[PDB]
């Protein structure tokens, strides 16, 4: 059908069709008389998977032969989403499969909707890991993703009575055709026990053993025949109060990989979580060393191995590597430390204090006794270095310590990561600067060379070609397909900004995507949006720092203005807000209820008509993002300046033809810089402004007293206007806004609504709105994760990316 | 190589080889450079499995078309063993696969040893279910086996310091290529809750729901292209104190199918066990009704459905069927009961009281409130019938009640089964008679027509062709292959009893099997047996009623006689005893220690030499039975008369060329009757003799006082002769033998040792020993499970067996 989807060869389609029928018969064990859509989905999945194996085997065989430097990306989250379409795209099999299934009388799009999302992540951090895997394979790097195979991923969100209800994400129920279990490569992981000091070295004895069983998933590069591996570990009890009970208690050990902690940017110091963190680190490091000893002088270890820590979650890799080198390999401390530092690199994802991992000493003491001793030794030697560089600066010593004193002694994992890594990077320029100027200022002064910036990016395969084929096609028509793996080429679209044909096509694609999504909304969930309105969307995890509340205030403002002057014309809008709240985050759960409550009033007010709709997008996840983003007109990126490290959803919207209303926070700054501030809807306080307000002291009452419209809104919330049966339902929200709002919602309210008016004004001019859209798409090239990975490769890992096709399958 | 293994066609081998390589590549995802023996085993397994699917699909499709009466065999145990070789045998693919793997440079026998046994059974009862499945498919019956998919089967037995150590049987670790998960057919099962009495009928509400997910395994008939199904249910928690904990607690529901209770002929009234029993019944009955409504007048239900209860374990099927018909389908009680009785049939497996299931009322009350009410109603109406037939016989009423009064009220499941079944059968003639004369005398008098006999049998495919190809071949040479599915034809071998060539061949095969096993003993376990000695073996579960102890006494007697007259000639013997003890059965565990202790003394006594060896066969299971039975010379079947209902191991030994020393118990009686008492080594008390002794009162002291050799043995045990470091180690054993031996070991001692002397005398005459062997093999035809199933079909289920090949694959 469309060019960018590949060729539908005669031999190819014929081959696909027979293998499809072969799997239906031999793999699913059903004949055409009783097969269901799900059976057809699996037959297709196995058929596509078959095309990967050959390339997967030779790619890995190739790394064994040439022995390049290996990149190990450790993350407790890999937010993969669906795999079928992505695999077809990267293998140039989409049109062929579409034709093959068409000839078999099946609709491939219907089959793709059957696949369960691999939701092994919470949001930004986990999706970044996923885009990175795609880019590393596309750039020909010998990269390995290592994580945990949770049998239950991020919970499925249900909305009941306007409230969020959580239910288990049993994503493996029908099986996972993409993974390959490798029970023969199971490795032991140790917990508890005690430390014995023998004649020659320390010994970790009397430990509890838990087995780590690996499941490998193929990660195909974009049309280069490279297929890397993502290895996820699963917990298994060894086989060695009653026989029955002993067998039943095996589940205690297997609970380690049972479920993903559903927290986004929040630290919950539970023992089970600590076990998960060590579990992934311990098993992964054995693979690394194993693989290294094959390719005993560990002096070349840093030349053959690079370990990237996605946040501090896998920080135990540092003392675990030291434990292995010192206790097992018997290297001297200084030698082991030199190796460790040159091998590890740490990526920070946020500056919010509640997100920082600070594990209680008593926990590490019981669970990992040897690691705590190693950590104390690292701290001791590190502080001696600070003391020597800043003689007499005693406060500096306590500020930089890995050991945090107080109520209960805690270990600051971020400090541990900085001390044990040769590189530390923020995820957006402004974020990286904030790290050097505040949170890690002391460390930056001691070792300035370690601090870097690596602005986040998103993969254009999944976030353009896959989710928005229509847009990818009209772009390809003018500049070719080369931009798919070289996004900077999108610049060339700048010379079409005045081309009447292109303007019309860009607007047509957006219109089609909106009709498509408007339909999906009714098919599933039975709603009523109007395709002609401006699609205003804010999708991301529910957080106070994200400020879904500021958006809510604007919505209520629009509603009140309409009720004040009913027969006045206003640009129609469909405001969509979606995102999950961590189960224990009370305020976040209240915000969801507020959104639905506003919708209940606004969506049934006769005077409003179809001029304003408020919809809460249920169960926001990767597959849903692939549907709503291509249909968006306005992207809401309104976090308080200095709180959103980077953001990546913002980049997805930019690449898909939506204009952005946002604060100068995270990557928004670089996006506006790339497209030009005139083509962005920037408003609100800058980081400096927030600091000034904090010096002075934030008093929300002031804004309430001087802004009539804002006062009216708070009084509506307080009096029960949005909760008739429960008049004080939103008391906590008002109380927070009025007395303890860390994110200063009121301070940006006036500038925000004024900016929104400018958005409505531009939307009334279709031609100019679209021309601004073209300028955003044309300058979104920098935000490709291929650029990001190329920078990590050259500036941190010391390896050169390659765009060379691997010697066929 | 050997005729009976099929043809090795040119096209067949070529096809097998490429599919083998296809699976290695696409299924195992490995190339020849790194594949291990286990990978090769799986490639072969998937290749063989592929040959089944076509036949499996058409067989099931066929039953849907013709709609024959369905046979449902419910059992909590299916002791399947390995599946690879059995599948090849039944598909006539053994020689082809042997050649194909040979050409690929692999040894198929080495690959077969890699397969894990499907040990979902304890012993006799579970193996019987397995042989039955094979026979039902071979006889073309539309039969379905229904059970539980335990993730942990019978424990693997390790011997440490002479003691049994149990370790988890993680048989699914590397996967099961034979099963097909069918998550789409998952069904709900209810527990707990309460009963509500509404205007029109009772309601079972507020229940806890557990999901039953089916896994289907193909059961191929012998070369008739019929492939039936064995459906095993797995417990799954539904998806609807903390979010994390809620997810973690899902395992509470999934524990239902976690492990097999390792008890053989012993009732342990644990709640988890009761849950397993209802779980299998509830899910299975929904399938049955589902399937019936397709093929609403339930009057034809008994004409389209037959439910066979393997022991009382699935007895809840009776009140569950009533619950469904009365509460859900709304049929009147009497109609529902008529249907239930005509549908259900019950098979009793033992008369020992400790094996009888008697569930406490308070347990059923809490777990299954509606079923208890139904049981009370059944009892009420049943007792009214007894009262009407035996007016005034008040003691009869309490003896026949399903409700047993006393300390704690209990429900006698055996009485429940008899009342709700149209047929009740014992498993051997003597056992069936004992049921009518004692245990169920009252029921037999009330309904004589219900009681039947169905002597057990074993499948000649697994127990002859598969485990003893050498013997199957020399038999086929003289009489053809027709006997494989018509064992009675073995009679024809009677005319070869004087044939010198046959005598020589029969003896040669036995010699080869012994050399083979003697080697296996050294490869694995490093032992020292001498292939020239008489192989005396007793393999079966360790039980006091089985009398491994009587065997031990004989062994010690032989040892003492040798020490008394060292330079006297005695027929060399290798005494092998193997079997597992239930973890909580103390005496059984002590018996294992005694056996190993005897071996420690006897196997290292210089004066004994290689004239006497005592070996304990570790981890006895189906795959091990397939190795040792073909190598046996003497089969020990020495249970106390009236305790072993049938036995099946006895039949396996007879078919494989071993002579039998045994008591007139269970099927031993019919075996001796078939071969002729002169060709059997019968000894000991008969059932009548045991009763006479019980009237009088058993006093072991008497035998101890009048038998010098017996006294010497007891004194050796008592003084620590077999346990130097622990002089009183076997005090419990001596105490039991002397004061509370329910099985009267001493009473059969003299006749047993005297009989053993006759065995040694015959063994000294190779020619005559073999001629007697031929007469046993020639008359073992009656013990084929094909005969047994044919009888169940005609006399209980009302269906005719067929030997017609299904219309090709
Ligand atoms: O278990 C049953 O009640 C039916 O099992 N049926 C099948 C069945 C059972 C087990 C394995 C494969 C298998 N295929 C089956 C079928 C198929 O492929 N097409 C049809 C059409 C109508 C009825 C049944 C089938
Ligand atoms: O095509 C269909 O609608 C159903 O095909 N169903 C089955 C089916 C088709 C093909 C192979 C096996 C097979 N088993 C099947 C079922 C089973 O085991 N239990 C149930 C309960 C309700 C509906 C269907 C089934
Ligand atoms: O004050 C409290 O007791 C909890 O404040 N909690 C949070 C909280 C406060 C302020 C900003 C963000 C934030 N996230 C929070 C949580 C989160 O993301 N997940 C959980 C789980 C259990 C309790 C709390 C949380
Ligand atoms: O992960 C690794 O360290 C190696 O992964 N290797 C393989 C590998 C990884 C994942 C899927 C398939 C796969 N096949 C692989 C190989 C194969 O088929 N033959 C060889 C020979 C030497 C090294 C490796 C292989
Ligand atoms: O052929 C061999 O002896 C080993 O092949 N090994 C592997 C291997 C072969 C083919 C595909 C994937 C693959 N992964 C492999 C391994 C892995 O993931 N971890 C270990 C640890 C120690 C030895 C081997 C492995
Ligand atoms: O007297 C006792 O406390 C136990 O007697 N137990 C048994 C027992 C006594 C006499 C004959 C057979 C027999 N089997 C027995 C058991 C068996 O097979 N499994 C278990 C598990 C836990 C306790 C006991 C048993
Ligand atoms: C890209 C993405 C995110 C991150 O969005 P932000 O707005 O940067 O927080 C979160 N969830 C999903 C499902 C995503 O696709
Ligand atoms: C046949 C068999 C049994 C039953 O043997 P008996 O001597 O009748 O108790 C038990 N276990 C296994 C593994 C068997 O093959």
UniProtKB/Swiss-Prot annotation, chains A, B:
Site features described as Can be labeled by an AMP analog, chain residue numbers: 144
E.C. number(s) listed in UniProt: 2.4.1.1
Pfam families: Phosphorylase
InterPro entries: Glycg_phsphrylas, Glyco_trans_35, Pyridoxal_P_attach_site
Modified residues (N6-(pyridoxal phosphate)lysine): 652
Record's keyword terms, sorted: Acetylation, Allosteric enzyme, Carbohydrate metabolism, Glycogen metabolism, Glycosyltransferase, Nucleotide-binding, Phosphoprotein, Pyridoxal phosphate, Transferase
Coiled coil keyword on record: no
Family: Belongs to the glycogen phosphorylase family.
Role: Allosteric enzyme that catalyzes the rate-limiting step in glycogen catabolism, the phosphorolytic cleavage of glycogen to produce glucose-1-phosphate, and plays a central role in maintaining cellular and organismal glucose homeostasis.
Listed name of the protein: Glycogen phosphorylase, muscle form
Species for this entry: Oryctolagus cuniculus
Gene: PYGM
């Amino acid at each position: 059908q469309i060019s960018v989807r590949g060729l539908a060869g005669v031999e190819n389609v014929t081959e696909l069709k027979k293998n499809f029928n072969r799997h239906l018969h031999f793999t699913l064990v059903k004949d055409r008389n009783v097969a269901t859509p799900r059976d057809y989905y699996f037959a297709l999945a196995h058929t596509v998977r078959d095309h990967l194996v050959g390339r997967w085997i030779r790619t890995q065989q190739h790394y064994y032969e040439k022995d390049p430097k290996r990149i190990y990306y450790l993350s407790l989250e890999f937010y993969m989403g669906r795999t079928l379409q992505n695999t077809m795209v990267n293998l140039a099999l989409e049109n062929a499969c579409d034709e093959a299934t068409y000839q078999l009388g099946l609709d491939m799009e219907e089959l793709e909707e059957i696949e369960e999302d691999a939701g092994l992540g919470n949001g930004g951090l986990g999706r970044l890991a996923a885009c990175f895997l795609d880019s590393m394979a596309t750039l020909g790097l010998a990269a390995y993703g290592y994580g945990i195979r949770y049998e239950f991923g991020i919970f499925n969100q249900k909305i009941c009575g306007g409230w969020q209800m959580e239910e288990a994400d049993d994503w493996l129920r029908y099986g996972n055709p993409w993974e390959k279990a490798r029970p023969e490569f199971t490795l032991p992981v140790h917990f508890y026990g005690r430390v014995e000091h023998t004649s020659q070295g320390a010994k970790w004895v009397d430990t509890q053993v838990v087995l780590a069983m690996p499941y490998d998933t193929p990660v195909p590069g974009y049309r280069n025949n490279v297929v890397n591996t993502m290895r996820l570990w699963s917990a298994k009890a060894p086989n060695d109060g009653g026989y029955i009970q002993a067998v039943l208690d095996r589940n205690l050990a297997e609970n380690i990989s049972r479920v993903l902690y559903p927290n986004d940017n929040f630290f919950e110091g539970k023992e089970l979580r600590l076990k998960q963190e060590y579990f992934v680190v311990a098993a992964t490091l054995q693979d690394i060393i194993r693989r290294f000893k094959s390719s005993t002088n560990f002096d070349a270890f840093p030349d053959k191995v690079a370990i990237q820590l996605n946040d501090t979650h896998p920080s135990l890799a540092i003392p675990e590597l030291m434990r292995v080198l010192v206790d097992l390999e018997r290297l001297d401390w200084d030698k082991a430390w030199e190796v460790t530092v040159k091998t590890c690199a740490y990526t920070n994802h946020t500056v919010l204090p509640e997100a920082l991992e600070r594990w209680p000493v008593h926990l590490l003491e019981t669970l990992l006794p040897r690691h705590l001793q190693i950590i104390y030794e690292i701290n001791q030697r590190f502080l001696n270095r600070v003391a020597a560089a800043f003689p007499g600066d005693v406060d500096r010593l306590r500020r930089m310590s890995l050991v945090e004193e107080g109520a209960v002694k805690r270990i600051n994992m971020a400090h541990l990561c900085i001390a044990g890594s040769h590189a530390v990077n923020g995820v957006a320029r402004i974020h990286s600067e904030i790290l050097k100027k505040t949170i890690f200022k002391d460390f930056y002064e001691l070792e300035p060379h370690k601090f870097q910036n690596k602005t986040n990016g998103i993969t254009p395969r999944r976030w353009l070609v896959l989710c928005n084929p229509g847009l990818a096609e009209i772009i390809a028509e003018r500049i070719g397909e080369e931009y798919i793996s070289d996004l900077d080429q999108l610049r060339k679209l700048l010379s079409y900004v005045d081309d009447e044909a292109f303007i019309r096509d860009v607007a047509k694609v957006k219109q089609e995507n909106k009709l498509k999504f408007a339909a999906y909304l009714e098919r599933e969930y039975k709603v009523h949006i109007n395709p002609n309105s401006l699609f205003d969307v804010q999708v991301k995890r529910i957080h106070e720092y994200k400020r879904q509340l500021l958006n809510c205030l604007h919505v209520i403002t629009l509603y009140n203005r309409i009720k004040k002057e009913p027969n006045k014309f206003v640009v129609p809008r469909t405001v969509m807000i979606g995102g999950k709240a961590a189960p224990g985050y009370h305020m976040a759960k209240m915000i969801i209820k507020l959104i639905t409550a506003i919708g209940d009033v606004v969506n049934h007010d006769p005077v409003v008509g179809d001029r304003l709709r408020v919809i809460f997008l249920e169960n926001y996840r990767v597959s849903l993002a692939e549907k709503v983003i291509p249909a968006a007109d306005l992207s809401e990126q309104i976090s308080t300046a200095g709180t959103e490290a980077s953001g990546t959803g913002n980049m997805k919207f930019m690449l898909n033809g939506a204009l952005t209303i946002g604060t100068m926070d995270g990557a928004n700054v670089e996006m506006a810089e790339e497209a030009g501030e005139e083509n962005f809807f920037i408003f609100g306080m800058r980081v400096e402004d927030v600091d000034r307000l904090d010096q002075r002291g934030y008093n929300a009452q002031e804004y309430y007293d001087r802004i009539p419209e804002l006062r009216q809104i708070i009084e509506q919330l307080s009096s029960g206007f949005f909760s008739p049966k429960q008049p004080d339902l939103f008391k906590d929200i008002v109380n927070m806004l009025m007395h303890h709002d860390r994110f200063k919602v009121f301070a940006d309210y006036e500038e925000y609504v004024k900016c929104q008016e400018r958005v409505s004004a531009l939307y009334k001019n279709p031609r100019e709105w679209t021309r601004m859209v073209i300028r955003n798409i044309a300058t979104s090239g920098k935000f490709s994760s291929d650029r990001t990975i190329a920078q990590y490769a050259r500036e941190i890992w010391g390896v050169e990316p390659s765009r060379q096709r691997l010697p066929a399958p």
